[PDB]
Amino acid sequence: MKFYIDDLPVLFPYPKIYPEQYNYMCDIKKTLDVGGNSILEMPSGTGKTVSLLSLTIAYQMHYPEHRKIIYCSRTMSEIEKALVELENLMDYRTKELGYQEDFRGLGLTSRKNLCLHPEVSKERKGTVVDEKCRRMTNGQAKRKLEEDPEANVELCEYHENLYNIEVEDYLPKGVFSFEKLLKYCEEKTLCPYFIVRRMISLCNIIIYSYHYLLDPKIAERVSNEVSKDSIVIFDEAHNIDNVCIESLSLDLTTDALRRATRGANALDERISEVRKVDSQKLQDEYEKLVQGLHSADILTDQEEPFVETPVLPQDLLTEAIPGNIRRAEHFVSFLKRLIEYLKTRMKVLHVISETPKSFLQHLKQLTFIERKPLRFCSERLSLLVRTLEVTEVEDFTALKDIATFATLISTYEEGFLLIIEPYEIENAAVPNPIMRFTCLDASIAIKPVFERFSSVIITSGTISPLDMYPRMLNFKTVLQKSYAMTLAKKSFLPMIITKGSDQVAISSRFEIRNDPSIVRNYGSMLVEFAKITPDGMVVFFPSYLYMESIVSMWQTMGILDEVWKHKLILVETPDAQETSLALETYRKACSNGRGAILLSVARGKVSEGIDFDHQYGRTVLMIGIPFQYTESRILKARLEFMRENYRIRENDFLSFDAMRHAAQCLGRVLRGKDDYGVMVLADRRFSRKRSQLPKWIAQGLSDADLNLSTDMAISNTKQFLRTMAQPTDPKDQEGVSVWSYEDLIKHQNSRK
Amino acid sequence: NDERNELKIDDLNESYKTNYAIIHLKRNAHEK
Amino acid sequence: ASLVASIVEARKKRTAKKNITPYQRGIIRSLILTLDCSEAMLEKDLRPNRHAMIIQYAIDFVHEFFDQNPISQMGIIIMRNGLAQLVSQVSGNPQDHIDALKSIRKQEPKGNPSLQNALEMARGLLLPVPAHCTREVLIVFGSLSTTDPGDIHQTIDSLVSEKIRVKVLGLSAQVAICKELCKATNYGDESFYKILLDETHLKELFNEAVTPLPVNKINKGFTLVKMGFPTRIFEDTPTFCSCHSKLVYGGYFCPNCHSKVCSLPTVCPCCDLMLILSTHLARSYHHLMPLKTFAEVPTTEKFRSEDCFSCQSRFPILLTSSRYRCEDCKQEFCVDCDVFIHEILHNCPGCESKPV
Ligand code: SF4
Ligand SMILES: [Zn+2]
Ligand SMILES: [Zn+2]
Ligand SMILES: [Zn+2]
Ligand SMILES: [Zn+2]
């Protein structure tokens, strides 16, 4: 349809529109017009991405500011889905306006997911792919070939072919998803990664993940190209704190330090050989360093620093090199003694938690390393590695971790902690000491975003309660609200099971993980629900270890044998490729009617973007509250920091963290309003967490289902499925849950 | 294409319309 | 307000009956009745068991189907041990199918069902059917899972290519493959996949399956079929029948080869000519000229007569007028008659009585 807001015409790509979608678009427009940030919670069963794209695109194409759009999701599959939705919307707009309006919309990702080189795309890790692509595109090979054609160094045809054409003619006008972009770039022998990286500054809407906006290692270069007045959308942003925390966290192991020593020795030998044969490079680098130049002024735009900036751009010192690490040999000795200090600190016999200030003071006492020279470690190492002609950097890969740790610890002092644990795994014959540098404040990484961008939309399907997010991340919202879906008939049945058919309490507490009664009760619940579930059944476990142990117990008891008769069994595995193939097999089994059951981890890879709708997702078994590991030093320190700073109780934060993932898994069942499912939360502890669930799930959770039994839940599930299998009366949803153009006009007239 | 079809929201599309053919039977037959 | 509630419920029920149009329907049908006999059919949700109730309703369905579709044919397949077992070849004799069901009712159901196997067997059975007939497959599915040796999607595509139409009646919940089959095989229509709610609704669904399905506008198979009307013969001595090679007192004489046949309607065993009676064709005229619905008269206006035109019965006197009228002739009818004229008879007495 094509309807009108107060002054903004918006073209919806469907003849029908939901009242929730209309209200959501109105609220988003109000937020954009008034300026500031907002928090929106939309039900998972109502089109959210389509409404967001429609309203934002109409806003940008109608108003004269023509503000660009930045879309930030949590996963690459979500980027693909958003790009597909954008392509559909643009197709509708092109069919309605009579012409293809000037528009360019691209996604952005790493080299591993966009490489077409037959010899570089066959790697199992992205770091190696990046290193090889740098070897083929840094310009060293091109310069060597220019000076001497006989040089055996080879180039990348995809990268070379781009120089022939201009940036504005890289791709035709339109929206390019990853699949279409790969097909086009394969047909024309071009590099999609470089196409996107060079067209970000020109696209109307750019779609990427939260890492490309929060992680300073890859965020600075991309952010330097986007506009300052663009709209910012955070889709599925309920789990943004974890990303913000992991952005500025490092872990060092004994193997890492042992490899760093070897890397330092190799660097010293390389410096010696280059000193013997070609020293003018060292002299030139030293001369440039003396004036006060940095990596920005030394490195060309074509090349990149060896060590990614681990701190935010605003926290980098703008002064010249201190002088202690101005020379190659002096810097090498400094780095070597830093590594030795780390090694001698890795010998503690009990957990030690210390602040960066204390660590720096002890360093300055035992050795003579000052804070300022430490702050420049990564930058100096990047310049040195660039100038030493180190085409093979396998030996030097280790020094990156040391540089990152040094530049972080010497940079930040508040909201950061250093934990040294003699036992990385308590269940180990020999000690394996580990040093973790952890960020406790989740607002440090996101402050620059909230200050640089004026209007920020934070939208999600299971972001509740909305009051904590402004508390946890220091930002203020003009409005924060959640929508209640105006269902004509109940389509999803949420229930909580606190005990088994034997009336014995059931829980997923780790200390009682290996309990015959609880394990057998869970297995009986699984079998009974699988017997009645038509096509698909997703089970989410609190942790992978718990899933493994309980599955082994079920295998011994023979419950899996009973499940096999009715459905195939697919299990999530650590290997990402194997998990993806398992997902494909599960979808095929659900489509062909064979019936399948998928076991996964509530905090795993499936729950962070894979969506089960219609035939794929019918019943969701949340086996226990996905509580984090309480006996974790990092989590305990974060809880203490939050209690002291934001006045958030440890129990409250833990319950919020678990309920957030439970709701995340729950919300992957509905796409439209014609989809239905049964959502069983199997734990005695959910009975008091109804107020903590999202509003649209709490409203559907009845008081009689707060504490049920397995048999009674099976009966309710059978009745609910039988009821939902009947044809819906069109009049029951003609104008109460689905609105036509006339109904929308009537709503606008009544409201006005 | 296939991804678009899978990702599209069917519930918001136009309702399916039957395409059954109607017939009008005229009655005019001669006597035996 | 309870009586008014009943009246408004009656009005809502009549609301659906209001919309009636002379849709084109294929009278000549070839039906394949597939029944599910698997471990999932041993449940007690239907008393005494799913197998018993389904078989009984299948027998009643066969009787009704051959009562109201004399010139159609039926075949029976069952699903047992993951294999499709044929128990009745396609034929026009209701007694053979009834006896086949009476034989089936004894064996206990076991194993898993195989929709792909059943569909392949149905396709093989419907291959030798004329292009002017409507090929239909009615499946009574009870399981929530399907075990098949091959690709079900390929079978669905083959069915669509063969222009077969599939109706599925479920027991517990919707199956994704069943929905896809019933939708893709019916030109996108999603109303041919029904899940029952109780025994009465199952009976209603089985009765609904009896009537012929309307044909699609783009699917044209118009043609003339050569059929003959034989003359009954009364003989003094038994004679050998050309169909069963058994002695019978008398039989219908084919008008094309003079061979005698025991019962009608059946394809002649000699000249391969269909033998039918005029009544067999007459049984389907109401499917081509449906009687227009009757709308109740508001109490505001004045009634014509105090007694029913068709049955001469006093109209009950009390809020809501208990009168139904025919727009074609404008004759008041009582509630009891309306259902009889729209369920048993197919002609309006007032319209017939009115001269022109
Ligand atoms: S330039 Fe592109 S195609 Fe070539 S190696 Fe790098 S990422 Fe791969
Ligand atoms: Zn005979
Ligand atoms: Zn004959
Ligand atoms: Zn009449
Ligand atoms: Zn009467």
From Swiss-Prot, chain A:
GO molecular function: any one? ATP binding
The catalysed reaction is: Couples ATP hydrolysis with the unwinding of duplex DNA at the replication fork by translocating in the 5'-3' direction. This creates two antiparallel DNA single strands (ssDNA). The leading ssDNA polymer is the template for DNA polymerase III holoenzyme which synthesizes a continuous strand; ATP + H2O = ADP + phosphate + H(+)
Q: Provide this UniProt record's keywords sorted from A to Z.
A: 4Fe-4S, ATP-binding, DNA damage, DNA repair, DNA-binding, Helicase, Hydrolase, Iron, Iron-sulfur, Isomerase, Metal-binding, Nucleotide-binding, Nucleus, Transcription, Transcription regulation
PANTHER family per the UniProt record, alphabetical: DNA REPAIR DEAD HELICASE RAD3/XP-D SUBFAMILY MEMBER, GENERAL TRANSCRIPTION AND DNA REPAIR FACTOR IIH HELICASE SUBUNIT XPD
User: Further notes on this entry?
Assistant: Present with 14400 molecules/cell in log phase SD medium.
Q: List, alphabetically, the NCBIfam families matched.
A: rad3
Explain the purpose of this protein: ATP-dependent 5'-3' DNA helicase. Component of the general transcription and DNA repair factor IIH (TFIIH) core complex, which is involved in general and transcription-coupled nucleotide excision repair (NER) of damaged DNA and, when complexed to TFIIK, in RNA transcription by RNA polymerase II. In NER, TFIIH acts by opening DNA around the lesion to allow the excision of the damaged oligonucleotide and its replacement by a new DNA fragment. The ATP-dependent helicase activity of XPD/RAD3 is required for DNA opening. In transcription, TFIIH has an essential role in transcription initiation.
Protein name stated in the entry: General transcription and DNA repair factor IIH helicase subunit XPD/RAD3
Swiss-Prot record, chain B:
Q: Where in the cell is it found?
A: Nucleus
Biological classification of the source:
Eukaryota, Fungi, Dikarya, Ascomycota, Saccharomycotina
Q: How does it assemble?
A: Component of the 7-subunit TFIIH core complex composed of XPB/SSL2, XPD/RAD3, SSL1, TFB1, TFB2, TFB4 and TFB5, which is active in NER. The core complex associates with the 3-subunit CTD-kinase module TFIIK composed of CCL1, KIN28 and TFB3 to form the 10-subunit holoenzyme (holo-TFIIH) active in transcription. An additionnal subunit, TFB6, plays a role in the dissociation of the SSL2 helicase from TFIIH after transcription initiation. TFB1 interacts with XPC/RAD4. XPC/RAD4 recruits TFIIH to the NER machinery. Interacts with the NER 3'-endonuclease XPG/RAD2.
**Any miscellaneous information on file?**
Present with 5150 molecules/cell in log phase SD medium.
Tell me the superkingdom of the source: Eukaryota
Q: Which residues form a coiled coil?
A: none
Name the UniProt record assigns to this protein: General transcription and DNA repair factor IIH subunit TFB1
State what this protein does: Component of the general transcription and DNA repair factor IIH (TFIIH) core complex, which is involved in general and transcription-coupled nucleotide excision repair (NER) of damaged DNA and, when complexed to TFIIK, in RNA transcription by RNA polymerase II. In NER, TFIIH acts by opening DNA around the lesion to allow the excision of the damaged oligonucleotide and its replacement by a new DNA fragment. In transcription, TFIIH has an essential role in transcription initiation.
Q: Which residues cross the membrane?
A: none
Q: Which family does it belong to?
A: Belongs to the TFB1 family.
Curated annotation (Swiss-Prot), chain C:
Q: Where in the chain are disulfide-linked cysteines found?
A: none
A GO-annotated cellular component: transcription factor TFIIH holo complex
**Zn finger (C4-type) location:** 254-271
Protein's GO biological process: nucleotide-excision repair; regulation of transcription by RNA polymerase II; transcription by RNA polymerase II; transcription initiation at RNA polymerase II promoter
From the UniProt record, list the coiled-coil ranges: none
Q: What is its main location?
A: nucleus
Name the Gene Ontology molecular function terms of this record. Answer: ubiquitin protein ligase activity; zinc ion binding
Instruction: Kindly list the places in or outside the cell where this protein is found, as annotated in its UniProt entry.
Output: Nucleus
User: What keyword terms does UniProt attach to this protein?
Assistant: DNA damage, DNA repair, Metal-binding, Nucleus, Transcription, Transcription regulation, Zinc, Zinc-finger
| Regions that span the bilayer | none
The VWFA domain, residue ranges:
30-209
Q: What else is known?
A: Present with 2340 molecules/cell in log phase SD medium.
Q: How does it assemble?
A: Component of the 7-subunit TFIIH core complex composed of XPB/SSL2, XPD/RAD3, SSL1, TFB1, TFB2, TFB4 and TFB5, which is active in NER. The core complex associates with the 3-subunit CTD-kinase module TFIIK composed of CCL1, KIN28 and TFB3 to form the 10-subunit holoenzyme (holo-TFIIH) active in transcription. An additionnal subunit, TFB6, plays a role in the dissociation of the SSL2 helicase from TFIIH after transcription initiation.
Q: Which family does it belong to?
A: Belongs to the GTF2H2 family.
Q: Quote the protein name from its UniProt record.
A: General transcription and DNA repair factor IIH subunit SSL1
